[PDB]
């Protein structure tokens, strides 16, 4: 099959990881010399086909700035997520550039460090917060609430 | 396609003592003009009595929703019933009442023998019951398959290539997409 071919070439082009010319593409997988593969390629707008001589251009996300990264959280307010496999493999190791973009301008949950970290990608405004000691957060969990309509009169009892 | 054929045809219909119909499952009758009997062979004669004179409403057919071929024979004519060297009959229904059943059998062994075959014995089975790559060449094949039909299951392509799973996995995972959902739930295409 020619389709084997085809994704086969997409693979082999992205083992590569640069752009490089046509003929030098279809002379590195040796018995793919099809013109039909070239085609489809030009008709497939996951790797990006540039007339300019031979160039291929690879997409998920074009993001491995800081900025970058905020634009496109920036563009998931009121919606849903992306993963991580597209960032790492847009840009390798952007777990450390998530541990340099302190308070909130780069969230995720820990989750645990022996899978890679499942990540996460939000936006809010501080989040880091860490300054709370632990025993304030320990004597705000032993605080046990009023329920029903108690604790606005124990509110308007103390002049709050 | 149902046909009266002619029921003009007069039958009697006779209530026989048992051994003599279980032999019947012949004779000669003799009408003497409001008492007949019946000479069989060699043998007894028998009075056979006008068990019900006017016998209406009761007829006799045969066969050959689903209809079937349905035939009419004839008018039931005369209720009798046969009536009976008596000695020997009177004796044979004297005998009927002798039936007895076997009782249960003692194991008159050493004990020893069946208490071994009871339990631990050493001697088990003796019956049969309820007793039960390289990558560019896999992924040929797949595009082979696919050209055969789009749509197969992970587990069926496992069954058809016969080959190391991991391999096979790791040539799914790269041309070809996982539909979860659907008709076409858990199979590449």
């Given at each position: 099959?020619?389709?084997?071919?085809?994704?086969?070439?997409?693979?082999?082009?992205?083992?590569?990881?640069?752009?490089?010319?046509?003929?030098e593409?279809?002379?590195?997988?040796?018995?793919?010399?099809?013109?039909?593969?070239?085609?489809?390629?030009?008709?497939?707008?996951?790797?990006?086909?540039?007339?300019?001589?031979?160039?291929?251009?690879?997409?998920?996300?074009?993001?491995?700035?800081?900025?970058?990264?905020?634009?496109?959280?920036?563009?998931?307010?009121?919606?849903?997520?992306?993963?991580?496999?597209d960032?790492?493999?847009?840009?390798?190791?952007?777990?450390?550039?998530?541990?340099?973009?302190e308070?909130?301008?780069?969230?995720?949950?820990?989750?645990?460090?022996?899978?890679?970290?499942?990540?996460?990608?939000?936006?809010?405004?501080?989040?880091?917060?860490?300054?709370?000691?632990?025993?304030?957060?320990?004597?705000?969990?032993?605080?046990?609430?009023?329920?029903?309509?108690?604790?606005?009169?124990?509110?308007?009892?103390?002049?709050? | 396609?149902?046909?009266?054929?002619?029921?003009?045809?007069?039958?009697?219909?006779?209530?026989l003592?048992?051994?003599?119909?279980?032999?019947?499952?012949?004779?000669?009758?003799?009408?003497?003009?409001?008492?007949?009997?019946?000479?069989?062979?060699?043998?007894?004669?028998?009075?056979?009595?006008?068990?019900?004179?006017?016998?209406?409403?009761?007829?006799?057919?045969?066969?050959?929703?689903?209809?079937?071929?349905?035939?009419?024979?004839?008018?039931?004519?005369?209720?009798?019933?046969?009536?009976?060297?008596?000695?020997?009959?009177?004796?044979?229904?004297?005998?009927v009442?002798?039936?007895?059943?076997?009782?249960?059998?003692?194991?008159?062994?050493?004990?020893?023998?069946?208490?071994?075959?009871?339990?631990?014995?050493?001697?088990?089975?003796?019956?049969?019951?309820?007793?039960?790559?390289?990558?560019?060449?896999?992924?040929?094949?797949?595009?082979?398959?696919?050209?055969?039909?789009?749509?197969?299951?992970?587990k069926?392509?496992?069954?058809?290539?016969?080959?190391?799973?991991?391999?096979?996995?790791?040539?799914?995972?790269?041309?070809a997409?996982?539909?979860?959902?659907?008709?076409?739930?858990?199979?590449?295409?």
């Open positions: 099959h020619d389709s084997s071919k085809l994704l086969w070439a997409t693979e082999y082009i992205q083992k590569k990881g640069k752009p490089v010319l046509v003929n593409l279809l002379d590195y997988l040796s018995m793919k010399k099809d013109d039909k593969v070239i085609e489809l390629l030009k008709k497939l707008d996951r790797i990006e086909f540039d007339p300019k001589k031979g160039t291929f251009k690879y997409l998920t996300y074009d993001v491995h700035s800081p900025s970058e990264l905020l634009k496109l959280l920036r563009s998931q307010v009121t919606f849903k997520g992306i993963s991580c496999k960032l790492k493999d847009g840009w390798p190791q952007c777990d450390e550039t998530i541990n340099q973009l308070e909130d301008s780069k969230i995720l949950v820990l989750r645990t460090k022996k899978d890679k970290t499942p990540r996460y990608v939000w936006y809010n405004s501080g989040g880091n917060l860490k300054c709370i000691d632990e025993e304030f957060v320990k004597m705000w969990e032993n605080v046990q609430l009023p329920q029903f309509a108690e604790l606005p009169r124990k509110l308007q009892d103390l002049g709050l | 396609d149902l046909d009266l054929e002619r029921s003009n045809r007069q039958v009697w219909l006779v209530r003592p048992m051994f003599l119909a279980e032999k019947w499952r012949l004779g000669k009758i003799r009408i003497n003009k409001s008492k007949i009997t019946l000479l069989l062979n060699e043998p007894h004669e028998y009075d056979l009595e006008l068990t019900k004179k006017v016998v209406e409403n009761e007829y006799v057919f045969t066969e050959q929703t689903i209809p079937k071929k349905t035939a009419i024979v004839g008018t039931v004519c005369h209720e009798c019933q046969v009536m009976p060297y008596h000695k020997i009959v009177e004796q044979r229904r004297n005998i009442k002798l039936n007895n059943k076997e009782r249960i059998t003692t194991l008159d062994e050493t004990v020893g023998v069946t208490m071994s075959h009871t339990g631990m014995s050493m001697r088990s089975d003796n019956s049969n019951f309820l007793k039960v790559m390289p990558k560019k060449e896999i992924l040929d094949y797949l595009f082979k398959l696919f050209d055969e039909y789009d749509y197969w299951s992970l069926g392509l496992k069954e058809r290539t016969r080959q190391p799973e991991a391999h096979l996995k790791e040539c799914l995972d790269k041309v997409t996982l539909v979860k959902k659907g008709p076409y739930a858990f199979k590449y295409t």
